[model samples]
Target chain A: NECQLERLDALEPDNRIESEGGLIETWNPNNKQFRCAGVALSRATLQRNALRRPYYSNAPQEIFIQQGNGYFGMVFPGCPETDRHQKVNRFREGDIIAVPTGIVFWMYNDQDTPVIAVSLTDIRSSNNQLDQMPRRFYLAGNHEQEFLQYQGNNIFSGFKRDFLEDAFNVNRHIVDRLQGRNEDEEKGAIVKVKGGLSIISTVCTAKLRLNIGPSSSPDIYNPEAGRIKTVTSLDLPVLRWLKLSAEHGSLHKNAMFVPHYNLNANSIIYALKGRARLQVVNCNGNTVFDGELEAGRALTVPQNYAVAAKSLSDRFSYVAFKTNDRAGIARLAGTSSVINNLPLDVVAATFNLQRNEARQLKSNNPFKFLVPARE
Target chain B: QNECQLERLDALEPDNRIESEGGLIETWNPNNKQFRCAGVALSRATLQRNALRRPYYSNAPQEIFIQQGNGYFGMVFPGCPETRDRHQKVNRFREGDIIAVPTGIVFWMYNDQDTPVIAVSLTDIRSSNNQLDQMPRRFYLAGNHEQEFLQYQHGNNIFSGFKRDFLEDAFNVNRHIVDRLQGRNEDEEKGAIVKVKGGLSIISPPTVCTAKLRLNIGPSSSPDIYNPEAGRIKTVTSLDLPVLRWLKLSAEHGSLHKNAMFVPHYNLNANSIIYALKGRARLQVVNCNGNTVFDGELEAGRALTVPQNYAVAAKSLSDRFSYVAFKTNDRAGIARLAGTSSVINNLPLDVVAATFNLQRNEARQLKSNNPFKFLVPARE
Candidate 1:
């Protein structure tokens, strides 16, 4: 019990951050992330229409924004045994939805116009850079009628009702003049106007992007260009909630991915736009946890730990916030690469494996997926 | 008794005035012959010395200041019987004195210099203007050396020792040197150097001066000048205290007998002065009952009152405070003519009788006798 008391003192819980775009998120990793990340807090969905699903992957969730509207959603992983059976939750303006970790899900705009949303998630772990959630489960779900029955009301009626009513009222005069009478269907329609386009969605897998060294410019890390690197204490704006605009998409170039570092304080992140998948790992780095940090659910990242993140969708944007003691983000170089560079045979031997399955990974040409969709 | 109580509600003391040349002289009558005067507060004789004496008229004790230096003194009569020579207790002040009016007492002050010395007396009255102490048989005492003597070992010794040393070192230095070199009497030596040139000792008595009617001024019947005119509140630049000071010495004429009328509220001195021999009747027209006022003893006259709401004191030459409500000098036309005014005859019967005795007869002479010779040590 005394040791437990000391352990409790060492642990850090998520500090509250302001909610944006109708989403609240919090995370603390300084404590045992396994216990802290296990607890979930969420808001009840209040939207009237639109199907929403949340799924979690190894990477911290990515949030996408649709311009103008206030519709937001999240993706979270399903039960580990039934990864494919992820639950999706949706929220229109004034509504909230939460998805726990490892539950695969997604959200969409019911209205013809775009709906903007902000998202947030926990930071990634550096000890295990490759500690990503298994993506095979979500991509390999049974699309059978029993498994993916499109039955019942999968949307928030209250949220959809207002969205539909607003859309219909905006088009009421036009529809009335064209038909020379009021169309009942038009009154019930959810999309009657052509608004700006925006999309916020999350995949059930970690997203990875590589930055190649410039071939011609070896001294690119000059003071002017590499100012962010020279600063000892980095100023990292924590994201707890984020909003996205379809008309003005987020520029991902400036996006930062911080690796696992000792967190001096707790944190919170909320999904404000689209859906986001979050992956968190403890200090040991062998065990990794995944979650879908959504509009309603909160993710806690304990202190003194490492974590990294990559956007998993088009314009993945979310406000990730953490109570950081330092003025800037803490980062370690090649920390992830070293974990990845370990010999597979040595790893298998250390695990006491009699036979190890080592498959040669073939390099896929970039942009191969753009050729066509394989049915 | 009920009627007496009702009349007491309107009972008021008299008003005293300040004088030029560093002393106070309050005349009791319009004839301006008999007057009670003192050197002033901070007069060297009254404040610097420590001694007491008896009155020349009676063994009734008097008090004196010893060792000679400038300071302050004040007094207040408890009340006297209808008959003269009737023994009455009164609060007195001598050198290095501080006192509180037990219930509230009417008193006044005198200074021998233009500069003013601090004089403070507290009363049991709640408000500043409550003169309830005017009721018969009430007494208010000023702090004195007797009190110091009683508590000398405890308190008075500490203060007196310093003062005694100061007199020897600072005030009596010449006398000390003469005593050592010539083997002369130090008391005589110091007295020779420190005595007042005019032999006037400061006495703080309360007195009232009436206004004089001049030609072309409003009807003398309803003299607007006689009304309680407004004068600025008196402020002691030295002590940071306030007392109304409106009567002033005549500027046009250097005559100490003539004075200017003062507006109590505005602190202004109009061209009017009344010289009285005994008490001038109705000079203090309105008396506030259950209110604090001023009352004091006299060396020459009787019946001095500083009505509730007014405070008076002897003038201090060093403090630059030069004004007198009434003086003890004689002026022919004004003194004789003003004495018969109806205002002089209508004062309270008892008060009139008291004032009559105090101002019975006196030759128009300025006695420059040292008032300190009459000082009496207050009993414990």
Candidate 2:
């Protein structure tokens, strides 16, 4: 209840809503941690040749594609439709997409396999003036299939038929059809995109997407140890505007990661594959969470909390979604640590070591972030 | 006619003013809804040359704005060892330098310069770090006269109020020395502020694990945003002074040309405690009730609270008007009403027309009404 970081939330949900062409699973953790962090998490699985209905949310969302490739079209206010007429973009497995508040967007799974994506919504963003819940307004769902109607009430359905006719400049019959007044037809929030979009998705030289996938240039790489690829503001400008970043980390078996902390950011780490033993130390130097992190589990790491991890299985993979675009990761053991900047005299006195002993301690570990579990 | 169209407040004079041979100390009663709602208290101190405002610490953190002259400010931080490796000196502060005194830091000020030193500070009384009530309290380490007036115990210094025998043992001093330390023989009112004969000496420590806390935000540095005709603005946020993120306070200096109006705008986050610096201007604030809450002239030395989301506009009355707006958030976003870069301009013409009951062309003209953005030009 008090932002328990050890309460590992399961990403794989037992409950999921069955849509026409996909499945929607919302991991809206009712815990205080998710609420205080102002983030709501959800997972969407779209089958091949399927598309999600066009809609905008009260909160801005960032989606991380977990599997397959697809086309994502987002229409921000006063911005051109970058998917058509001359714009281009592609989102493969491991790519992240930023959807700002009230920006209508849709995803189409054009590849052979299902496109699975996990998204984090900033519910308390400055743009969200209403309630805390992420209210999604769709331009396409019919009758019971709509998010509002799926619950019960809707601002659109409340509109009188005559008002709808007048506002849309349509006939009464057309208005009734538009409002889904008749129960004859049925369409869920997501439908088959068998007939790919009519508007041709054009191509451009410019890119609208960036990735922190395994193939991405790693910001931290150790030949026989591990690799960390971070999609920071320096790599993607959109992240700077969104105040969000992501990192893909892979650790070799029996190797340990350097104890590190984000200087000005909170991170929600999701285990992608294999297992790792994680130890999180709070500002008070008390261990907050120390346990095995399995695949499909998520945990919150607060700002400035030192995190130590050891790969228990071969190639332990995970992704960390951060709150800041520029998360200065300060390692506690590497040359990047503060020890390098401190005087040997002070360091020796702090740990009851002699000046030469402090110098030996600093020089002994010259390797980067990840180190072997043992010789 | 029902609710007051404008909450007009004349320049607020100090509610309490203490005068002495050393200098004068003035403080405003912070029980008002405006100050309480913002968790802030206002106090001003003016030290005459050769004056020393004795070492003291308050229950809450403070941000002091130096208004005039130069002075030496001293701070004693707990747990910060007094080492000789670092230089022994007082913080030499000048006009327009901002001093952030964290809670429990014993501080003293001396006007060593020839002129008087004037400073105004805002303390956050409602800070969770404060262990007291909403009312502000100050603890003097060694000032008998000042401590006497604080609680008004018939001019009894804290030491004098204590048992002299106990203090003699606690401070490891003789009974005669203890009586002198407790001010037992002192009958005169040196007051809280007193004159120093040969000036005062202070040793300051190089506090470890601290940031670049104090900053000089004055006219000495070029304005961050300066328009050729419309004046200038300089902002100091957490990015500029990283300590502000922890202090939960930030500021900006704005100067406007005569007749020039700062465009109607509102901070999306955080209330602004605006303190006027020099010259004069008229500030008009409006609420969602389609009514004006505050509309009046704000001159130098006066302060006002501009509540968050309450749009306010300012127009210069003098040759040039300058003021400092202290914000509550590190990143305060301001939404303006006009200019091509405004919210109205971002919306579709049809949506704007339908919302305002105007023609599409008229809506276009509305978005383009003001060629100037945030700080508008005097002439169209």
Candidate 3:
């Protein structure tokens, strides 16, 4: 395998790429916000490298992860060896999967070849948390024995047979209710099912490589055949993104600069390799930072500040993860970020002030006009 | 009769008071982020208010004129008249009608009680770039013979005759298409036999006085029953709002403190008061404006700001109106308006400092050690 691996012998060890056989590349997750602490990884690389779904317990969001190939792993209310109905590959390389306040999951390297990876999740939590039976047994106990028995236990023979049977009844009920319903009608349909909803575990794996396509391709939506269903429940909100890849060669200095648009939310940029230059624009479009950024740097851009990124190296690959969550981003326009501190002058300059210009600019008061100095 | 007369005049001059008759008092339409304004009446006096669905040549947002104790008069489209089936009363108001903008219905009073008290409506395009017919024209027009018809004309001999002959045909079509189908059966049903889609129009009145309730109170959805069943259609984008009114009130203070919570794209509140209500946060909400607002006083400039308190009195009540469109005081939290130009400590704060404090404050970014002033030079 050509993938890289780095192990932390001690908590203070520097980030050094060790051997080339892990599932991810551990890097900084809070690049957009300038939080120098925390870790991230590209889930797409893992999937592309043939890492199967049902990853190690504890789906953490702090680590940016994306699903690239095969069926992404899913965690049921309980551990079920088969009949995983909900396909959960809604992530991309730049997406951050937040770990719930406190929860765990079981992840497996389902690929045949050794799936190499690197993790920058909350090490204190993921490593310190006891790998006890309660966590492991809970996942094992939720398997559907009857479904396995019906399929005749070719692959799931080791799963708890009785547990699998009980889970089979649950799956049947879900299929009977939601199987053929229109996608629109199925919104919030999971709420009607008896068992609690199966959430995307808070395991953030930064996606480094994503192939955008129709929702049907295995590499795109359905990673596993008839195993997991892509989550179409919630539509993705608009994003302030800067997407790039090293498909050809290293990116040249100031090769490409993004447009200077206001960022509706905070963002985190994951640097896969090479480097890029970030420029912050004032209300008048003045340059704040025209400097270059090395790989593995977390750059945080505050809300409303206009910013752009340029590839410093011709072969650089990167992704951006915004601070706005699914729900918060939905209603962000009217939130305190946009409303309370709307700067009238900034709005006037932005929209070309007209009669009633004062009133039009009322919401954008108290804007922070300074562009931060990049380190 | 006294109550109705006051609302007619209040529509023209929101501050006009109704004397002796405890009716609508102190009406003013608050301007929204877009191109519209609305008002709320503070009285509860009832009036014999009614709607007249008559056809006419000009189909503009109707300018209401009231004849107290008799009926109401307004313009419609080229094909509409006080027919039995084609017209509808989209909204109404008595003493305290809340006139939201863009789509609200406003009434005028001539003050000529002895001369059949007439109400004349003219398009108010002071704030908008749209010309006549360029604005929304949904109501059909009536011929000269039926031009003088009023709301009271309904239930009269002429109305009954019109209903029996013309309205019956239009209503039959509605029933055939809308009521007869169920689920997949609806798909199989096609052509004129198919039911007409049901439409709902909202009417808001002043909050102060008893709003006139001169409704037909019939089982049918639309009141101006016509022969062809015309549905009102009015379309305006989010950017065109700068001038529309339901009531005209004097700005309480010279500043014209009109506070509202706008949710744009919904195009409601000040602009489309016809179907929406003025959104008011209970406690002067801090961050409830919308994505953009076009301030008339500010010379048609756009601002990406919250809908804070709008402090301007209407300069032209002749066209502006007021209504209590809506009130959304049920917010989760209240906003705090910090008065300082900038927090000195916060001025030097970096993104790293801000994030640490933001996460610490439960995802809130406001702080003492952060810069509060605009970093760039203030531009006009």
Note the DockQ of each predicted structure: 0.00, 0.01, 0.01
Task: Show model 2 residue runs off by greater than 4 Å.
Answer: A1-14, A80-88, A143-158, A170-177, A180-187, A194-207, A360-363, B1-380
Tens digits of per-residue lDDT for model 1, B69-147: 2333222222212110111122333322222221112222223443333221111111112111111111101111121
The C-alpha stretches of model 3 lying farther than 4 A from their native spots are: A1-72, A78-104, A110-254, A282-288, A324-375, B1-380
Best by DockQ, which number? 2
Note each model's CA RMSD in angstroms: 37.9, 15.2, 27.9
Candidate 2 lDDT by residue in tens digits, B1-380:
22212254345556777776588888766765666666677788898988877655565677787878887766654323223122112567888777777654556777877999988887776554343245665644333444321421112333343344333322333566445544455443555566766554333334232566578788786677677788887777778877666567777778899888888888888777788888889998887676777788999878877777878899999889888777767676788877647889888889999999999889989999777767876876
Measured against the true structure, the TM-scores of the candidates, in listed sequence, are 0.18, 0.54, 0.28
Candidate 3 lDDT, B1-380, residue by residue in tens: 12111111111222222222211222222222121222111111122122222212211232232212232222111111221011223333222111222221212211111222222122232221111112222211111121111111111111111212111121222222212111112221121011111211122231211222222211222322121111111121111111222222111001111331111122122221221012211111121232112332211111111122421122211111122212111111112222124222234445535645545443224444322221111113
For this target, which candidate reaches the highest TM-score against the unseen true structure? 2
The numbered model that scores best in lDDT is 2
| DockQ category of candidate 2 | incorrect
Q: Looking at candidate 2, what is the lDDT of residue B350?
A: 93
Task: Provide the fnat value for model 3, as a fraction from 0 to 1.
Answer: 0.00
lDDT, each prediction: 0.24, 0.66, 0.25
